[model samples]
Target: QTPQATSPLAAWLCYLEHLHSELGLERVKQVAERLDLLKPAPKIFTVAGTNGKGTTCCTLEAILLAAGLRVGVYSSPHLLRYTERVRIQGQELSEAEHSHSFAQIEAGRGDISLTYFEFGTLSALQLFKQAKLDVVILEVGLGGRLDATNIVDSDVAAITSIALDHTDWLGYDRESIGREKAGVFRGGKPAVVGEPDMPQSIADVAAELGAQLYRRDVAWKFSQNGWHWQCGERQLTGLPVPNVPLANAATALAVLHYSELPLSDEAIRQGLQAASLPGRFQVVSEQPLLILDVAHNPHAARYLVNRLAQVIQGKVRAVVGMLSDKDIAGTLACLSERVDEWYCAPLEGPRGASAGQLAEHLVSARQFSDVETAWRQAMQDADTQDVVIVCGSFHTVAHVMAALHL
Candidate 1:
């Protein structure tokens, strides 16, 4: 029987419960082509990579907004509300706007089935088209080659820090994954690569596609002298390092330069300082220090551990939950020394890893059925001098955020 929903949240849940989780690109391509979502916009940026895509999008959104251009950004796995996936001028789309977009998408996609992500992508595209924004930024949910967001031809494409991830779909190693991520690059257009030591396949694809590849350390570079960052001939001295990493900020700058958009140096500096993502090293409290980061994979875990070591003075206790597909062992290994205790929980989804499964790999681990229970326990046990870190999946951070009323 066909599912029926009266509210936007119900409609979203209907898709999630009924639709096949991973049907690849055929359905999305057909529906998008039918709906005319594959053509040019005022300006579009499609960002793809194993890590740093969210940060890159946030950086781009900030810079564009600072440059006085109306910007629309669509990101995946929103930390809290579904509306957070779509933003205009850095604000979440209103529920009414989201419902209207979904209705339009439903009307256009008659008899066509879309995965949950595809539905969200179509809604974002429709809203963006109506707003007629100055620029639209789309972050890839998975591998770039067939991600629903890739349906649109981007004005500028960026690949940030490719690493081994989503091995089941993209492949098992960096070389295979890099090629898949390179799918966002278009022929005869600019592509910015943030990884200074990228896999050979990335360069190969750019060469084959005739993409004007602006590689890090070659086309543009950034160095940190205190809080200052310099790239190309532009320099932003005495700037605050963004909550998002500088690597992503540098990549966003390259994309902006190649985008041919006029931006003042002051705007760039302001954007860098102002841009922030919620779950990336987000510090929620001071006494009994709390930090949350959605770093599920080994590559991102390495960065998370290093950052925690730098900023934290007390022993670290982690409340973690991960998808079953993630490299849990590798991720745990990366933070072994930094983290002292583990509060493991099973995410409330089909792909979520069970607490027992996570506990099997840890010596100092405790299991809980849900995130809130584990988080409360961690906070209860923590002392004023101790630090509580929440790291793993976006779902983990979102759950804790709601628990804390953040």
Candidate 2:
């Protein structure tokens, strides 16, 4: 049953609720009070940006875990399970653990009209507290300041490569988005930015509030030496690095170095080797090096095209699907000639694009009734020499993965 404020829209619901039809400042206060009510806030590293937010948070968690510290992470838009949203010690909590947290929130939150994200975040906090973690890495679900994750004040903050996304709610331009992301930074605290090209809005915050903005080009950088990618003094070797590259490695090194964590070269190397986030330049198979990436928009689409070209040398057959609200044409325009065969599929959800509708936008003549049918068709049609990729929205990729048993 849906509440009076929210309709029975199921997964389509996405918005912050108001208190008596106003912004819930008191609730925000209560959440902050609850944090004050608990023990000292966990050594937090709050990360906000358009791209690389999830990966950066994932990398931070992995690095801390490698250093023998108990780490907790909270991320959004799970590919498989709700448990994937809240991780403990580099892995998601078990089903029983998730249920336990859910029950706790259900009992305590009483009559407080919270957004789905707010409720989940509250549950995540309880779980993190229960785990007695050394560090908890929080990722902003959307624009900073007002984002649900920002309810907790961060000890340290980083924004990784701000880009034009969530413009409808965020702002109309990159500068606007950058400003919103900059809200994560607190005065006199070490705030980091991993993008080389800093925006004016970010610069404005840094200048006005003395946000110690450690930028990528100036404070830290990545270097290519033989087969290894080295950032600061830490080097990761041998593994096939993706074309899109892990900007988080550089960001993490800078952060750890600044925090006086005394991270050794070996610790950094071990951390890099162990750090992994699925669905972004993730290789799922070896025969033809099948890759899966959840790049739902133009910015990520262009990045995916570059990855496809650089990672594996072959014709790329891509199984693509997207949400109806996304800039689908803009996403396709990025690939242009790079896409060998476009295996379009209909997403199962309400906002999912029908294969025919997607096909109509493409010059290519291939389409499928659904994700499962598209995957099988793409597999059967492609040769062993070709590289097959499943890319686009998370739900689209998840549908394919579920059908493929991946």
Candidate 3:
């Protein structure tokens, strides 16, 4: 039942409609096996976690490429464009590349059904195969164990952090969720844990799989200044902090260190400074101090709240929207009294929460129909000494960014 969308836009429209897989990973995995997508697997890295996976993958790509290793990275929930899902050598593919890969995947499939995510994953994996790549980084989606990215036998796997998110689908508690995220770890391969308080189930699963565990603060430790690889007795200090979350930054370094890539301190420093993701603490404006982050959970929200306070001294104006089922109360609570004003907007999707819905959980709130209005209002009201933040959801951040033509 193909829609005959030979064009990129049409193909993407078709892809978006099939949000759920008909045959789970079976159909997608069969198509991948048919294509031999993993034949020349050159040190694939799978990133798993609730919050830090995106930043971790970005940092890994920046550092790996700095070391002169040709790397391809595939992460999910593209901010601005479909091509953002796949990056070869830190470059986004053109619309032409997107269409070509979907067509290839289509040509290889013989009536197998794939979800939007599954289809996108296979497309990126195929492109990584075609490109001359020394490493591939796949950001494992919410489905950790059976994520489409999990089909590839990753050389090194890292869980950036496990926190409460997608709890209704994954699990109610950290320990329950830990076992699921830990499924990315393979036996005898390096399984890096960036979560400082590692859940027992994660350790249990790692032991069961016999993954050469490198738990942060155990095998390796990092401070704001630098890192110490206790297992290898190697310490690298006097490093420039990465633009991404430092916890994930430290994990990125650890992943590269254990990833068998030719890594150097110079490359580390260069990559740390060079690495930047759009929504991960993206500083869009300097005057009003507008920051964009896709942090919607307690862990994500709390980190940004504390970090922003430390670096900037200003009253905060926040433009936020969230999916209906997200921990709205918990997430908004983390922002706390620091946020002086809330310009809330509705995301407009079926699952998206309304501005009024969000304002219920927020303080000094005002509701708007859309993100742009909220953003504009926040920006207008924000003084030069004030800070405005667009956050809550990826769609929320993208909506604001796209409105500003960023």
Candidate 4:
């Protein structure tokens, strides 16, 4: 029953025309109707907000896998491969598998076209249902309400931290953003917000929907004890997790409890230690330590700076690269005092910031053509004890990670 255009490129090409003609939400509904595609009614969880979405998904996947459950995770904007977005038991969907699913989607559709995101999402769901997964974790690509993933009824919900990004689409205010993120919450479901300062709108919407909202200080919590992370009554020890332990721990604990999973001390320990999403406070080296953080917003940038102050000793040399749309001034201000010197590079993309472009923003820093040039300079310039940090965007981190093989 496969369509003539069954290749991945053709599947993507089908979305391009739709993307040019309609906004994402319309395309999703259109495709769903054409394919008679109904979400499989799996135990669904939606993680939203501007930051920490990826981290929360990673933690949830880890804990579920630890408890001997089959987990399917769907995240967005993969750095390496498109298949990285749809994973089962921590493994990416193979090329052949994704190709086969693309054929399924093509055959199911009659005349209606699917956007790129909708095509991938539907394909991922098809795989998940057939895999007999215990649960599925989906990260909101944009705002919560109209996001293609929102078409499903969620059993559990989470919003990591609300911030000022994507102001054009979601609105310039945090309250409005909170309202959009609240769209994923279904009545009687357990919804968790990680930010201790929950937006009034976020809390109110959950109440209106009759969702059992778990605010950080109110419902679930976590504490970091040096190397180990503790959640509620469960303690995880001897785990090497990313530096942002608090947010990851909080989200994981909420998911486990809300899902009614029986977590042991050992399971908790393994999950905590095993959970790590690359390019977010990921340390690649020890001697003259090198850390990579995809901190695109001021909120995430400040947290990275704070973690650096705690985890690093001796002078810090900052090797930074960023994009055009990010809050460049605010992000730099957060770590300016802690950084001994700055090396900036322009990533390769429509949103990338050029060396000269970044220099226009900073009065005190050196600019280079690319990440490698800047990184080489940073290493050559660093003292034996000084730490180097590579950060800014996912694009920037990808290049650096390729160079380091981390």
Provide the overall lDDT of each model, using Cα atoms, as 2-decimal numbers: 0.84, 0.72, 0.84, 0.76
Q: How well is each residue in 1-406 modelled by candidate 2, as lDDT tens digits?
A: 2232223222223222322243543564465355442332458788888888887877676667778888888898888767788888777766666555555554465666566677677778878877888888888888877777777767788988776643255457778878888888877778888877778898787777777877787656665532444445665555333223467666765667666665555556566667777787788876666778898777888788876777654577888888887777777777655787789988876778888777887886588777778878878877777888898789877886787676
Question: Candidates ranked by TM-score, best first?
Answer: 3, 1, 4, 2
Model 3, position 328, has a per-residue lDDT of 89
Kindly provide the TM-score of model 1 when superposed on the true structure, using C-alpha atoms: 0.93
lDDT of 1 by residue, 298-360 (tens): 888888888877876467889999998888878877877689888999987689999987888
The order of the candidates by lDDT, greatest first, is: 1, 3, 4, 2
Which residues of candidate 2, in runs, are more than 4 Å off? 1-29, 35-41, 166-171, 226-244, 312-314
Query: lDDT per residue, candidate 4, 253-317, as tens digits?
Result: 77667877577766666676678887878888877788888887778877888888887637887
Who is ahead in lDDT, 1 or 4?
1
- Taking all chains together, the TM-score of candidate 4 against the true structure is 0.88
Model 2: number of clashes? 0
Q: Is candidate 2 or candidate 4 better by TM-score?
A: 4
The alpha-carbon deviation from the true structure for residue 246 of candidate 3, after best TM-score superposition, in angstroms, is: 1.1
lDDT of 3 at 346: 95
TM-score of 2: 0.87
Q: Pick the candidate with the highest TM-score.
A: 3
Q: Which portions of model 3 miss their true places by more than 4 Å? A: 1-5, 19-24, 167-171, 225-232
